[PDB]
């Protein structure tokens, strides 16, 4: 399956070689001739007056190989002008042997990414719903208005905004492969590429993602403050957390958009080359991931030190649940993320597929895991729910 971006790359190479032919082919035998031209769909050579000119359908089409016997043609008119209709104001061409271009299926993404799409979409759907319910529950009860509950409420808003931004991304990319945007000799998709809407949605996604990871970092730092300090921490730290979880991701996400116009503005900030520019966003995100993991492990050390004597059946339950969250996030997530600094520069393949599988399924279902963990499974929320019911 030939992807859009790969089609653009091949087309650009077609244009390079094509312009080179335009420059190097010798001029025609006589000045009675219409001029060779590249019309962005084919390189037309000079034409004898009153004759047909043929070129193969341009090979950058994803399906050019299915109609190799087809050709596209122009007519060089007898007045030495290219034939054009008084109407279309643009020169006539016949693309019919290559018209399956409008309705063919060859320009599709790799099916494996479509396999991951249903998974992470379902995970952000259930996470979005349960986070909406749980956020309504913690927000709704005046007796539950804890400071830590407001922190978890901010984490819920971060996961929800993340699921929304990923939904708008899936709508945009789904439209990019739709038959309407993939018009015959598609141009409306290019007009969408020039739009601010093409890039602003993806930048908004980048902010929701970096804000989600930084909010997980605020969650880990808050747990370490409640446990290592054992203090009833105040509002100055809370004002700091509000500045951090929405502020820092803005702080390194804005430059990524500035560079995204200054270079790769033709990419609609979707596909990205120049790996350092992509490190501009992911590298701080890798920092938040690794630091949140290290605070996680340190909290595990604190619980290993402080509960050393007590063992009850509830400790057998919740302690095993801590083994579940460790084996899910500590044992696996940080391995793929810390190695990911090397895993996208190289080491692609089925290993890349397993990497996207574990990371996508993880962060997709982590919002549901946080909704059930910080709300529905909380004991005080259960007894308080049974107080009225």
């Amino acid at each position: 399956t030939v992807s859009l971006w790969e089609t653009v790359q091949k087309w650009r190479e077609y244009r390079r070689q094509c312009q080179r032919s335009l420059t190097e082919d010798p001029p025609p035998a006589t000045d009675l001739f219409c001029n060779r031209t590249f019309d962005e769909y084919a390189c037309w050579p000079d034409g004898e007056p009153g004759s047909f000119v043929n070129v193969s359908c341009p090979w950058y089409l994803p399906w050019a190989s299915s109609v190799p016997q087809g050709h596209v043609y122009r007519f060089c008119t007898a007045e030495g002008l290219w034939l054009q209709k008084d109407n279309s104001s643009l020169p006539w061409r016949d693309l019919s042997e290559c018209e399956e271009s409008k309705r063919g299926e060859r320009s599709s993404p790799e099916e494996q990414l479509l396999f991951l799409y249903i998974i992470y979409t379902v995970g952000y759907a259930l996470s979005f719903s349960a986070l909406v319910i749980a956020s309504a529950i913690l927000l709704g009860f005046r007796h539950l208005h804890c400071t830590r509950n407001y922190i978890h409420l901010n984490l819920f808003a971060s996961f929800i905004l993340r699921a929304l931004s990923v939904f708008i991304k899936d709508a945009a990319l789904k439209w990019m492969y739709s038959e309407a945007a993939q018009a015959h000799q598609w141009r409306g998709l290019l007009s969408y590429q020039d739009s601010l809407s093409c890039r602003l949605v993806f930048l908004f996604m980048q902010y929701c993602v970096a804000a989600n990871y930084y909010w997980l970092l605020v969650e880990g730092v808050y747990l370490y403050t409640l446990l290592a300090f054992s203090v009833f921490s105040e509002q100055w730290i809370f004002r700091l957390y509000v500045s951090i979880g929405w502020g820092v991701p803005l702080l390194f996400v804005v430059p990524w958009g500035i560079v995204k116009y200054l270079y790769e503005d033709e990419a609609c900030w979707a596909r990205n080359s120049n790996m350092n520019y992509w490190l501009i966003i992911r590298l701080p995100i890798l920092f938040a991931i690794g630091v949140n993991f290290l605070i996680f492990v340190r909290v595990i050390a604190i619980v290993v030190s402080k509960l050393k004597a007590n063992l009850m059946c509830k400790t057998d339950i919740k302690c095993r649940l801590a083994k579940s969250t460790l084996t899910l996030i500590a044992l696996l997530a940080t391995v793929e993320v810390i190695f990911a600094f090397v895993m996208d520069e190289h080491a692609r393949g089925t290993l890349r597929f397993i990497k996207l599988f574990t990371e996508l399924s993880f962060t997709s279902f982590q919002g549901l895991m946080v909704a059930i963990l910080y709300c529905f499974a909380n004991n005080e929320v259960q007894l308080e729910f049974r107080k009225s019911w």
């Binding site: 971006w5 993404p109 991304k169 990319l173 993806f202």
Partner: peptide, 8 residues
């Protein structure tokens, strides 16, 4: 999301 979009 950001990485997956590329190959997509």
């Amino acid at each position: 999301x950001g990485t997956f979009t590329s190959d997509x």
